[PDB]
Design a protein around this nucleic acid. Structure first.
Ligand SMILES: [Mn+2]
Ligand SMILES: [Mn+2]
Ligand SMILES: [Mn+2]
Length: 391
RNA sequence: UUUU
């Protein structure tokens, strides 16, 4: 049926960037249950001395005891985010002011789209109480994840497939061996030393909810935070400044590896720029998954590093440029903000990037889909009642 | 989280 499309070459004229600020946080515990009071108790702190790095940490250590959340249980959870929002807004006596409320991974997909043209995007947009609630199409995502899985099983040897699954584990192991549950001053020597034996899980999470903007649009983004650098300030407008994102990558050996590392680093920049995270730490590991060295990047410096790398030139259309991405992102969110009637709660929309047709479109959902979205699948009855109560 |  009919759909409105934004041309893929659309770009905002300038870049008016607002500084992000954390509004509140919440957490997920080791059993997968969300926590809304004293969530700061779930924030870890970065701690990884060179002397420890020198020992040659095995990042596949403990792979067989990995406590891994099933993928079906690890989708972005609007229920819990809305519950966190009701708690905050009840304290403030007022709704959060924003045009869009969503998860950061969703905007990361949009922002990085210009240099990741083969990757699909399928989202749902639900207007409610003067705001746009945006979530991913869970069913399509799971279907793509399953089909990616079966590809990778079929097309790689048993050895390569096992290695790739171990590489998935490596990311979480690095987080485990590079962080401590409290700042250096409150942690004991045992805790520090025993990290390499701790059971690794990906259940526990600390989530920041931030307000930010671009152009004249306001966005609230929920995103998971890997750790805190030194201490968490009490000053609300400074909390984001102390967060850190962790990554792992293979040590780099040829120019092929250099362009791939540029691509990953851009995606890391996308994720951290949106969230106000100022530090990205890479754990570089070898073929046997031993950690070899660690490097800190300042988020704000990444655009310069990318623009000035003598090894990674390409045609202007293919060369990653952070400013160009930001102008595409700004065009998208302004389009969403002026196209959809935020006051019409009678329907919902699919927002889709289709790489085969090269199109970026908004179309109305089916009545049954709108109903599901508004009665549990995105909006919850507790949240709708809360918002109706303020008016 | 993750593949040179
Ligand atoms: Mn984690
Ligand atoms: Mn993370
Ligand atoms: Mn990370």
């Amino acid at each position: 049926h009919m759909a409105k499309s934004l041309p893929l070459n659309s770009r905002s004229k300038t870049t008016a960037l607002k500084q992000p600020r954390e509004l509140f946080s919440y957490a997920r515990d080791i059993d997968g249950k969300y926590v809304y009071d004293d969530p700061e108790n779930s924030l870890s702190y970065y701690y990884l001395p060179d002397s420890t790095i020198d020992t040659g940490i095995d990042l596949q250590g403990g792979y067989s005891k990995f406590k891994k959340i099933p993928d079906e249980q690890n989708l972005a959870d609007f229920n819990s985010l809305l519950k966190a929002i009701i708690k905050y807004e009840t304290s403030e006596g007022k709704k959060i002011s924003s045009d869009i409320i969503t998860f950061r991974e969703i905007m990361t997909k949009i922002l990085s789209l210009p240099y990741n043209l083969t990757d699909p995007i399928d989202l749902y947009v639900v207007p409610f109480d003067g705001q746009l609630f945006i979530k991913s199409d869970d069913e399509l995502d799971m279907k793509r994840r399953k089909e990616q899985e079966v590809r990778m099983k079929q097309t790689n040897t048993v050895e390569r497939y096992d290695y790739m699954k171990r590489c998935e584990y490596v990311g979480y192991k690095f987080e485990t061996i590079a962080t401590i549950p409290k700042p250096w001053s409150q942690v004991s020597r045992s805790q520090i030393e025993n990290r390499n034996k701790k059971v690794v899980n990906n259940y526990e999470q600390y989530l920041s909810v931030i307000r930010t903007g671009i152009g004249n649009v306001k966005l609230v983004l929920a995103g998971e935070i890997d750790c805190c650098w030194d201490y968490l300030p009490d000053e609300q407008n400074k909390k984001l400044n102390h967060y850190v994102e962790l990554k792992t990558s293979r040590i780099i050996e040829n120019n092929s590896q250099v362009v791939s590392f540029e691509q990953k680093l851009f995606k890391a920049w996308c994720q951290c720029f949106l969230m106000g995270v100022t530090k990205i730490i890479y754990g570089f590991r070898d073929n046997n998954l031993i950690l070899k060295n660690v490097e800190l990047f300042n988020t704000e410096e990444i655009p310069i590093l990318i623009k000035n790398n003598p090894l990674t030139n390409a045609a202007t259309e293919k060369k990653i440029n952070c400013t160009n991405a930001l102008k595409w992102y700004g065009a998208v969110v302004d389009w969403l903000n002026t196209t959809v009637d935020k006051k019409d709660e009678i329907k919902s929309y699919r927002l889709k990037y289709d790489p085969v047709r090269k199109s970026f479109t908004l179309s109305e959902t089916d009545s049954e889909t709108n109903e599901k979205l508004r009665n549990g699948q995105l909006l919850t009855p507790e949240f709708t009642e809360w918002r109706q109560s303020l008016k």
